Amino acid sequence: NVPTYPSCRDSETFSTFLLDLFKLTIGMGDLEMLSSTK
Amino acid sequence: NVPTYPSCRDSETFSTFLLDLFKLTIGMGDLEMLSSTK
């Protein structure tokens, strides 16, 4: 700090990142940015 | 010319300018119309 993926890492971080990973490449070229990073 | 970027300048000015041009070379690409120029 809270169990939200667009802020923190959860159990589904293994899933939802790699879903959002190639989506951002092909057609989701708009922002889609994870603010809370180190 | 008021201290807002998408019509203007007053430095750092530039990192957001690359977002304006790189999206124009691809799809989603909002016009972000800079008719506010001289």
Side-chain angles (χ1 to χ4, degrees), chain B residues 4-31:
Chain B
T4 63
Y5 178 67
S7 66
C8 205
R9 58 185 300 161
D10 275 334
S11 298
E12 291 289 329
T13 279
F14 183 74
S15 65
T16 56
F17 190 75
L18 270 309
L19 270 304
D20 295 331
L21 269 68
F22 184 75
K23 295 293 104 178
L24 196 35
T25 60
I26 51 97
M28 294 293 173
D30 195 3
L31 57 43

PDB file of all heavy atoms in Angstrom, chain B residues 4-31:
ATOM      1  N   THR B   4      -0.470  25.193 -20.066  1.00  0.00           N
ATOM      2  CA  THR B   4      -0.879  23.833 -20.410  1.00  0.00           C
ATOM      3  C   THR B   4      -0.162  23.486 -21.708  1.00  0.00           C
ATOM      4  O   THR B   4      -0.021  24.344 -22.583  1.00  0.00           O
ATOM      5  CB  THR B   4      -2.388  23.717 -20.564  1.00  0.00           C
ATOM      6  OG1 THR B   4      -2.822  24.538 -21.655  1.00  0.00           O
ATOM      7  CG2 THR B   4      -3.085  24.167 -19.289  1.00  0.00           C
ATOM      8  N   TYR B   5       0.295  22.238 -21.820  1.00  0.00           N
ATOM      9  CA  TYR B   5       1.034  21.810 -23.009  1.00  0.00           C
ATOM     10  C   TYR B   5       0.256  21.809 -24.324  1.00  0.00           C
ATOM     11  O   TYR B   5       0.729  22.460 -25.265  1.00  0.00           O
ATOM     12  CB  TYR B   5       1.657  20.419 -22.826  1.00  0.00           C
ATOM     13  CG  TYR B   5       2.366  20.012 -24.093  1.00  0.00           C
ATOM     14  CD1 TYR B   5       3.503  20.693 -24.507  1.00  0.00           C
ATOM     15  CD2 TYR B   5       1.892  18.969 -24.889  1.00  0.00           C
ATOM     16  CE1 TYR B   5       4.142  20.356 -25.670  1.00  0.00           C
ATOM     17  CE2 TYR B   5       2.529  18.629 -26.059  1.00  0.00           C
ATOM     18  CZ  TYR B   5       3.655  19.321 -26.436  1.00  0.00           C
ATOM     19  OH  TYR B   5       4.294  18.978 -27.590  1.00  0.00           O
ATOM     20  N   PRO B   6      -0.938  21.099 -24.491  1.00  0.00           N
ATOM     21  CA  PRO B   6      -1.386  20.740 -25.855  1.00  0.00           C
ATOM     22  C   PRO B   6      -1.785  21.891 -26.776  1.00  0.00           C
ATOM     23  O   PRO B   6      -2.226  21.665 -27.906  1.00  0.00           O
ATOM     24  CB  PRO B   6      -2.587  19.821 -25.599  1.00  0.00           C
ATOM     25  CG  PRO B   6      -3.117  20.254 -24.317  1.00  0.00           C
ATOM     26  CD  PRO B   6      -1.933  20.653 -23.491  1.00  0.00           C
ATOM     27  N   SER B   7      -1.633  23.124 -26.300  1.00  0.00           N
ATOM     28  CA  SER B   7      -1.575  24.286 -27.175  1.00  0.00           C
ATOM     29  C   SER B   7      -0.256  25.043 -27.116  1.00  0.00           C
ATOM     30  O   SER B   7      -0.109  26.024 -27.851  1.00  0.00           O
ATOM     31  CB  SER B   7      -2.716  25.257 -26.845  1.00  0.00           C
ATOM     32  OG  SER B   7      -2.567  25.813 -25.550  1.00  0.00           O
ATOM     33  N   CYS B   8       0.718  24.637 -26.297  1.00  0.00           N
ATOM     34  CA  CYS B   8       1.762  25.583 -25.920  1.00  0.00           C
ATOM     35  C   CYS B   8       3.096  24.897 -25.605  1.00  0.00           C
ATOM     36  O   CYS B   8       3.336  23.758 -26.017  1.00  0.00           O
ATOM     37  CB  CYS B   8       1.257  26.412 -24.734  1.00  0.00           C
ATOM     38  SG  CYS B   8       1.994  28.029 -24.541  1.00  0.00           S
ATOM     39  N   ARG B   9       3.961  25.592 -24.859  1.00  0.00           N
ATOM     40  CA  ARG B   9       5.357  25.243 -24.577  1.00  0.00           C
ATOM     41  C   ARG B   9       5.620  25.650 -23.123  1.00  0.00           C
ATOM     42  O   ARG B   9       4.774  25.311 -22.288  1.00  0.00           O
ATOM     43  CB  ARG B   9       6.334  25.821 -25.614  1.00  0.00           C
ATOM     44  CG  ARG B   9       6.397  27.312 -25.857  1.00  0.00           C
ATOM     45  CD  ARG B   9       7.362  27.542 -27.004  1.00  0.00           C
ATOM     46  NE  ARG B   9       8.701  27.053 -26.692  1.00  0.00           N
ATOM     47  CZ  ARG B   9       9.629  26.792 -27.607  1.00  0.00           C
ATOM     48  NH1 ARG B   9       9.360  26.965 -28.893  1.00  0.00           N
ATOM     49  NH2 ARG B   9      10.823  26.349 -27.237  1.00  0.00           N
ATOM     50  N   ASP B  10       6.799  26.229 -22.786  1.00  0.00           N
ATOM     51  CA  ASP B  10       7.328  26.404 -21.421  1.00  0.00           C
ATOM     52  C   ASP B  10       7.781  25.088 -20.808  1.00  0.00           C
ATOM     53  O   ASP B  10       6.992  24.336 -20.229  1.00  0.00           O
ATOM     54  CB  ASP B  10       6.402  27.159 -20.445  1.00  0.00           C
ATOM     55  CG  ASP B  10       6.544  28.665 -20.552  1.00  0.00           C
ATOM     56  OD1 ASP B  10       7.629  29.128 -20.968  1.00  0.00           O
ATOM     57  OD2 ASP B  10       5.592  29.388 -20.192  1.00  0.00           O
ATOM     58  N   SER B  11       9.089  24.848 -20.965  1.00  0.00           N
ATOM     59  CA  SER B  11       9.885  23.633 -21.107  1.00  0.00           C
ATOM     60  C   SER B  11       9.512  22.369 -20.342  1.00  0.00           C
ATOM     61  O   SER B  11       8.786  22.389 -19.341  1.00  0.00           O
ATOM     62  CB  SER B  11      11.336  23.963 -20.744  1.00  0.00           C
ATOM     63  OG  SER B  11      11.871  24.927 -21.631  1.00  0.00           O
ATOM     64  N   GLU B  12      10.142  21.293 -20.829  1.00  0.00           N
ATOM     65  CA  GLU B  12       9.920  19.848 -20.841  1.00  0.00           C
ATOM     66  C   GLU B  12       8.968  19.400 -21.944  1.00  0.00           C
ATOM     67  O   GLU B  12       9.049  18.236 -22.352  1.00  0.00           O
ATOM     68  CB  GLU B  12       9.400  19.319 -19.495  1.00  0.00           C
ATOM     69  CG  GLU B  12      10.400  19.376 -18.350  1.00  0.00           C
ATOM     70  CD  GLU B  12      11.525  18.372 -18.506  1.00  0.00           C
ATOM     71  OE1 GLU B  12      11.281  17.294 -19.089  1.00  0.00           O
ATOM     72  OE2 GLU B  12      12.651  18.658 -18.046  1.00  0.00           O
ATOM     73  N   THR B  13       8.064  20.250 -22.455  1.00  0.00           N
ATOM     74  CA  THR B  13       7.812  20.594 -23.869  1.00  0.00           C
ATOM     75  C   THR B  13       7.918  19.515 -24.972  1.00  0.00           C
ATOM     76  O   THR B  13       7.209  19.590 -25.984  1.00  0.00           O
ATOM     77  CB  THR B  13       8.716  21.819 -24.171  1.00  0.00           C
ATOM     78  OG1 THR B  13       8.068  23.005 -23.695  1.00  0.00           O
ATOM     79  CG2 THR B  13       9.136  22.016 -25.638  1.00  0.00           C
ATOM     80  N   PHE B  14       8.616  18.410 -24.716  1.00  0.00           N
ATOM     81  CA  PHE B  14       9.239  17.672 -25.805  1.00  0.00           C
ATOM     82  C   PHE B  14       8.971  16.181 -25.711  1.00  0.00           C
ATOM     83  O   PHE B  14       8.812  15.502 -26.728  1.00  0.00           O
ATOM     84  CB  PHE B  14      10.742  17.959 -25.802  1.00  0.00           C
ATOM     85  CG  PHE B  14      11.485  17.318 -26.929  1.00  0.00           C
ATOM     86  CD1 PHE B  14      11.379  17.820 -28.214  1.00  0.00           C
ATOM     87  CD2 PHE B  14      12.304  16.226 -26.702  1.00  0.00           C
ATOM     88  CE1 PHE B  14      12.067  17.236 -29.255  1.00  0.00           C
ATOM     89  CE2 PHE B  14      12.996  15.640 -27.738  1.00  0.00           C
ATOM     90  CZ  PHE B  14      12.876  16.146 -29.017  1.00  0.00           C
ATOM     91  N   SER B  15       8.945  15.652 -24.487  1.00  0.00           N
ATOM     92  CA  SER B  15       8.656  14.236 -24.288  1.00  0.00           C
ATOM     93  C   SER B  15       7.212  13.929 -24.655  1.00  0.00           C
ATOM     94  O   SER B  15       6.901  12.859 -25.190  1.00  0.00           O
ATOM     95  CB  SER B  15       8.946  13.845 -22.839  1.00  0.00           C
ATOM     96  OG  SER B  15       8.064  14.513 -21.956  1.00  0.00           O
ATOM     97  N   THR B  16       6.316  14.877 -24.381  1.00  0.00           N
ATOM     98  CA  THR B  16       4.936  14.743 -24.825  1.00  0.00           C
ATOM     99  C   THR B  16       4.805  15.027 -26.317  1.00  0.00           C
ATOM    100  O   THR B  16       3.813  14.639 -26.944  1.00  0.00           O
ATOM    101  CB  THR B  16       4.040  15.676 -24.014  1.00  0.00           C
ATOM    102  OG1 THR B  16       4.522  17.023 -24.128  1.00  0.00           O
ATOM    103  CG2 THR B  16       4.029  15.259 -22.548  1.00  0.00           C
ATOM    104  N   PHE B  17       5.790  15.711 -26.903  1.00  0.00           N
ATOM    105  CA  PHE B  17       5.743  15.990 -28.335  1.00  0.00           C
ATOM    106  C   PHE B  17       6.044  14.736 -29.144  1.00  0.00           C
ATOM    107  O   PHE B  17       5.541  14.574 -30.262  1.00  0.00           O
ATOM    108  CB  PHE B  17       6.725  17.106 -28.685  1.00  0.00           C
ATOM    109  CG  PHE B  17       6.582  17.628 -30.084  1.00  0.00           C
ATOM    110  CD1 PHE B  17       5.523  18.454 -30.424  1.00  0.00           C
ATOM    111  CD2 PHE B  17       7.522  17.319 -31.054  1.00  0.00           C
ATOM    112  CE1 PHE B  17       5.389  18.954 -31.697  1.00  0.00           C
ATOM    113  CE2 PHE B  17       7.397  17.825 -32.334  1.00  0.00           C
ATOM    114  CZ  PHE B  17       6.327  18.642 -32.654  1.00  0.00           C
ATOM    115  N   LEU B  18       6.865  13.835 -28.594  1.00  0.00           N
ATOM    116  CA  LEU B  18       7.146  12.575 -29.277  1.00  0.00           C
ATOM    117  C   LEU B  18       5.946  11.641 -29.233  1.00  0.00           C
ATOM    118  O   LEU B  18       5.774  10.801 -30.123  1.00  0.00           O
ATOM    119  CB  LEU B  18       8.378  11.894 -28.678  1.00  0.00           C
ATOM    120  CG  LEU B  18       9.753  12.214 -29.277  1.00  0.00           C
ATOM    121  CD1 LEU B  18       9.689  12.025 -30.776  1.00  0.00           C
ATOM    122  CD2 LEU B  18      10.250  13.605 -28.948  1.00  0.00           C
ATOM    123  N   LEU B  19       5.110  11.763 -28.200  1.00  0.00           N
ATOM    124  CA  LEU B  19       3.859  11.012 -28.158  1.00  0.00           C
ATOM    125  C   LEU B  19       2.889  11.506 -29.225  1.00  0.00           C
ATOM    126  O   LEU B  19       2.072  10.742 -29.747  1.00  0.00           O
ATOM    127  CB  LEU B  19       3.227  11.103 -26.766  1.00  0.00           C
ATOM    128  CG  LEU B  19       3.600  10.039 -25.725  1.00  0.00           C
ATOM    129  CD1 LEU B  19       3.291   8.658 -26.270  1.00  0.00           C
ATOM    130  CD2 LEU B  19       5.048  10.123 -25.253  1.00  0.00           C
ATOM    131  N   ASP B  20       2.976  12.790 -29.565  1.00  0.00           N
ATOM    132  CA  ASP B  20       2.096  13.363 -30.572  1.00  0.00           C
ATOM    133  C   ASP B  20       2.446  12.868 -31.970  1.00  0.00           C
ATOM    134  O   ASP B  20       1.569  12.681 -32.822  1.00  0.00           O
ATOM    135  CB  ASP B  20       2.176  14.889 -30.498  1.00  0.00           C
ATOM    136  CG  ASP B  20       1.642  15.431 -29.191  1.00  0.00           C
ATOM    137  OD1 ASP B  20       0.756  14.781 -28.598  1.00  0.00           O
ATOM    138  OD2 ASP B  20       2.112  16.503 -28.755  1.00  0.00           O
ATOM    139  N   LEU B  21       3.736  12.640 -32.217  1.00  0.00           N
ATOM    140  CA  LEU B  21       4.185  12.304 -33.563  1.00  0.00           C
ATOM    141  C   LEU B  21       4.224  10.799 -33.782  1.00  0.00           C
ATOM    142  O   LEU B  21       3.951  10.315 -34.886  1.00  0.00           O
ATOM    143  CB  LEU B  21       5.555  12.929 -33.839  1.00  0.00           C
ATOM    144  CG  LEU B  21       5.571  14.328 -34.463  1.00  0.00           C
ATOM    145  CD1 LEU B  21       5.040  15.393 -33.524  1.00  0.00           C
ATOM    146  CD2 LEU B  21       6.975  14.674 -34.926  1.00  0.00           C
ATOM    147  N   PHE B  22       4.566  10.040 -32.740  1.00  0.00           N
ATOM    148  CA  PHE B  22       4.677   8.595 -32.895  1.00  0.00           C
ATOM    149  C   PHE B  22       3.307   7.948 -33.055  1.00  0.00           C
ATOM    150  O   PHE B  22       3.170   6.919 -33.727  1.00  0.00           O
ATOM    151  CB  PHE B  22       5.425   7.991 -31.709  1.00  0.00           C
ATOM    152  CG  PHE B  22       5.656   6.520 -31.832  1.00  0.00           C
ATOM    153  CD1 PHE B  22       6.622   6.032 -32.696  1.00  0.00           C
ATOM    154  CD2 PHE B  22       4.910   5.623 -31.088  1.00  0.00           C
ATOM    155  CE1 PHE B  22       6.838   4.675 -32.815  1.00  0.00           C
ATOM    156  CE2 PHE B  22       5.119   4.265 -31.201  1.00  0.00           C
ATOM    157  CZ  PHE B  22       6.085   3.789 -32.066  1.00  0.00           C
ATOM    158  N   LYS B  23       2.273   8.541 -32.454  1.00  0.00           N
ATOM    159  CA  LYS B  23       0.927   8.005 -32.626  1.00  0.00           C
ATOM    160  C   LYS B  23       0.367   8.351 -34.001  1.00  0.00           C
ATOM    161  O   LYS B  23      -0.528   7.671 -34.514  1.00  0.00           O
ATOM    162  CB  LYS B  23      -0.007   8.497 -31.515  1.00  0.00           C
ATOM    163  CG  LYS B  23       0.340   8.028 -30.090  1.00  0.00           C
ATOM    164  CD  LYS B  23       0.164   6.525 -29.864  1.00  0.00           C
ATOM    165  CE  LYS B  23       1.510   5.792 -29.838  1.00  0.00           C
ATOM    166  NZ  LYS B  23       1.404   4.340 -29.580  1.00  0.00           N
ATOM    167  N   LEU B  24       0.903   9.398 -34.621  1.00  0.00           N
ATOM    168  CA  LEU B  24       0.412   9.830 -35.922  1.00  0.00           C
ATOM    169  C   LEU B  24       0.926   8.899 -37.017  1.00  0.00           C
ATOM    170  O   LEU B  24       0.333   8.811 -38.096  1.00  0.00           O
ATOM    171  CB  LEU B  24       0.828  11.278 -36.182  1.00  0.00           C
ATOM    172  CG  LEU B  24       0.138  12.063 -37.298  1.00  0.00           C
ATOM    173  CD1 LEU B  24      -1.329  11.678 -37.421  1.00  0.00           C
ATOM    174  CD2 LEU B  24       0.258  13.544 -37.015  1.00  0.00           C
ATOM    175  N   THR B  25       2.020   8.189 -36.739  1.00  0.00           N
ATOM    176  CA  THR B  25       2.604   7.251 -37.692  1.00  0.00           C
ATOM    177  C   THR B  25       1.953   5.873 -37.613  1.00  0.00           C
ATOM    178  O   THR B  25       2.287   4.975 -38.391  1.00  0.00           O
ATOM    179  CB  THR B  25       4.107   7.137 -37.454  1.00  0.00           C
ATOM    180  OG1 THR B  25       4.342   6.672 -36.119  1.00  0.00           O
ATOM    181  CG2 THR B  25       4.770   8.491 -37.633  1.00  0.00           C
ATOM    182  N   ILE B  26       1.033   5.699 -36.668  1.00  0.00           N
ATOM    183  CA  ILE B  26       0.337   4.436 -36.440  1.00  0.00           C
ATOM    184  C   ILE B  26      -1.158   4.719 -36.406  1.00  0.00           C
ATOM    185  O   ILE B  26      -1.613   5.767 -36.878  1.00  0.00           O
ATOM    186  CB  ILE B  26       0.836   3.698 -35.176  1.00  0.00           C
ATOM    187  CG1 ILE B  26       0.854   4.589 -33.928  1.00  0.00           C
ATOM    188  CG2 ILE B  26       2.206   3.073 -35.427  1.00  0.00           C
ATOM    189  CD1 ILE B  26      -0.363   4.482 -33.008  1.00  0.00           C
ATOM    190  N   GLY B  27      -1.928   3.791 -35.849  1.00  0.00           N
ATOM    191  CA  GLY B  27      -3.364   3.743 -36.016  1.00  0.00           C
ATOM    192  C   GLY B  27      -4.054   4.733 -35.101  1.00  0.00           C
ATOM    193  O   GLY B  27      -4.238   5.876 -35.534  1.00  0.00           O
ATOM    194  N   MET B  28      -4.466   4.301 -33.894  1.00  0.00           N
ATOM    195  CA  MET B  28      -5.337   4.984 -32.925  1.00  0.00           C
ATOM    196  C   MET B  28      -5.203   6.503 -32.865  1.00  0.00           C
ATOM    197  O   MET B  28      -6.216   7.207 -32.948  1.00  0.00           O
ATOM    198  CB  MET B  28      -5.070   4.427 -31.523  1.00  0.00           C
ATOM    199  CG  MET B  28      -5.469   2.978 -31.334  1.00  0.00           C
ATOM    200  SD  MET B  28      -7.251   2.751 -31.438  1.00  0.00           S
ATOM    201  CE  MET B  28      -7.369   0.965 -31.402  1.00  0.00           C
ATOM    202  N   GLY B  29      -3.972   6.991 -32.674  1.00  0.00           N
ATOM    203  CA  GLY B  29      -3.464   8.253 -33.201  1.00  0.00           C
ATOM    204  C   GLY B  29      -4.346   9.483 -33.271  1.00  0.00           C
ATOM    205  O   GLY B  29      -4.723   9.896 -34.374  1.00  0.00           O
ATOM    206  N   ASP B  30      -4.722  10.044 -32.119  1.00  0.00           N
ATOM    207  CA  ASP B  30      -5.590  11.219 -32.067  1.00  0.00           C
ATOM    208  C   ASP B  30      -4.852  12.399 -32.688  1.00  0.00           C
ATOM    209  O   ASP B  30      -3.619  12.462 -32.634  1.00  0.00           O
ATOM    210  CB  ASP B  30      -6.003  11.521 -30.629  1.00  0.00           C
ATOM    211  CG  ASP B  30      -7.175  12.486 -30.545  1.00  0.00           C
ATOM    212  OD1 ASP B  30      -7.707  12.887 -31.603  1.00  0.00           O
ATOM    213  OD2 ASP B  30      -7.563  12.853 -29.414  1.00  0.00           O
ATOM    214  N   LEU B  31      -5.608  13.316 -33.293  1.00  0.00           N
ATOM    215  CA  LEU B  31      -5.042  14.385 -34.110  1.00  0.00           C
ATOM    216  C   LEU B  31      -4.189  15.353 -33.297  1.00  0.00           C
ATOM    217  O   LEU B  31      -3.129  15.771 -33.778  1.00  0.00           O
ATOM    218  CB  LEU B  31      -6.168  15.086 -34.896  1.00  0.00           C
ATOM    219  CG  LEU B  31      -7.478  15.794 -34.473  1.00  0.00           C
ATOM    220  CD1 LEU B  31      -7.440  16.734 -33.277  1.00  0.00           C
ATOM    221  CD2 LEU B  31      -8.039  16.543 -35.680  1.00  0.00           C
TER     222      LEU B  31
END
